[PDB]
Design a protein around this ligand. Sequence first.
Ligand SMILES: CNS(=O)(=O)c1cccc(C)c1F
Ligand SMILES: CNS(=O)(=O)c1cccc(C)c1F
Ligand SMILES: CNS(=O)(=O)c1cccc(C)c1F
Ligand SMILES: CNS(=O)(=O)c1cccc(C)c1F
Lengths: 193, 193
Amino acid sequence: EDAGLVAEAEAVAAGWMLDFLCLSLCRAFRDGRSEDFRRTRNSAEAIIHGLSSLTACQLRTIYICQFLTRIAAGKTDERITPLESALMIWGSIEKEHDKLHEEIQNLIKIQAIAVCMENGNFKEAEEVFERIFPFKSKLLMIISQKDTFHSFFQHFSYNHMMEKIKSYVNYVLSEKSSTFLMKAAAKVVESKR
Amino acid sequence: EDAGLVAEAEAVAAGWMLDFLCLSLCRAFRDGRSEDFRRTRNSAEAIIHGLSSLTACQLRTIYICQFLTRIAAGKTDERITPLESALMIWGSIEKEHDKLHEEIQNLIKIQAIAVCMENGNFKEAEEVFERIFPFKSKLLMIISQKDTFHSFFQHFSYNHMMEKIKSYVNYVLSEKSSTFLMKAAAKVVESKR
Ligand SMILES: CNS(=O)(=O)c1cccc(C)c1F
Ligand SMILES: CNS(=O)(=O)c1cccc(C)c1F
Ligand SMILES: CNS(=O)(=O)c1cccc(C)c1F
Ligand SMILES: CNS(=O)(=O)c1cccc(C)c1F
């Protein structure tokens, strides 16, 4: 056997596993299956360690997985919160900055502050505000008054953030629905049955 | 879409990933590629968390992976050493107890003691001896005298243990060489080249 060709076949298989695990992670995020999401994320992280060179498509795939991981840890080394880390990934993925991209960005920006207020950590809420940001003075007064349920926070809500992110996830899910591993697996299941 | 059929396709794909990762783990163990082995092992462990029901074949596959993991940590919660844990797995795998099985068993039994002596921990070497075992009195005198390079230890050597285990690994490697994921990956590589 040729060690070089074996390593190449392993890299091809790792690429197939990555797309399958991104698909699975997307579905688990959409369905709210927390434990399944946690398990798929762990598998994705481990599989990604086996890849040392990634194409542009594979980089988008791993950054979508990292972004969803941060969003899922939103209410739970970097010196920033998970939602701030999701914002950094979101603003750096090679993707179009369309209307949906902007809506998700602004929702994460507000929720990075609101999740701290929901948890009763108002000093952290002001620290998140300072790192991200008359609009600013209005938002700072709201945080300062612990006005967690202000109409601004109710419009830029956690539920609205999750709904917009789930709409984006449906596009990723559609784009990867035909990838090799899930497609071959669905054929085996349809043949049974 | 049907959640039940999606979960079934994910279980089929996990089964394919498990066989591919067992193959990769076996090759890495045979080649002495330590870092590749460590990475494949981490991926295998994570993938196996996604399976809640295993067939007899899948149980053999995960126990072969666990056995090789313990052997690889041989010189590096359970209250026993890695080689003692490899011995427990080895004696419980659903496999034929042929000549090779016995040779590997006896080599691990001696090496579980010898690796402690190699590391200069003779109290641990006697504790391993007590947990595993005129032959016994001869072996205990050898450990007691720190006679690490006694002709008995040179015949039941670490190198001999690794050679016998590698011969067994070649049978696992041959048995799984045609599994779905590695086979489809090799076709893609051969088409390029
Ligand atoms: C999927 N992408 S990843 O590169 O495996 C990754 C790296 C670091 C942290 C996380 C959560 C992560 F998911
Ligand atoms: C600098 N703030 S902003 O980006 O202009 C802004 C204005 C209004 C609402 C939101 C969520 C927002 F992020
Ligand atoms: C592959 N089998 S396994 O079940 O993932 C496993 C469980 C516990 C410890 C180890 C090292 C292990 F590999
Ligand atoms: C109880 N000891 S034993 O199993 O009979 C034995 C005899 C000789 C050599 C070895 C390695 C051995 F394990």
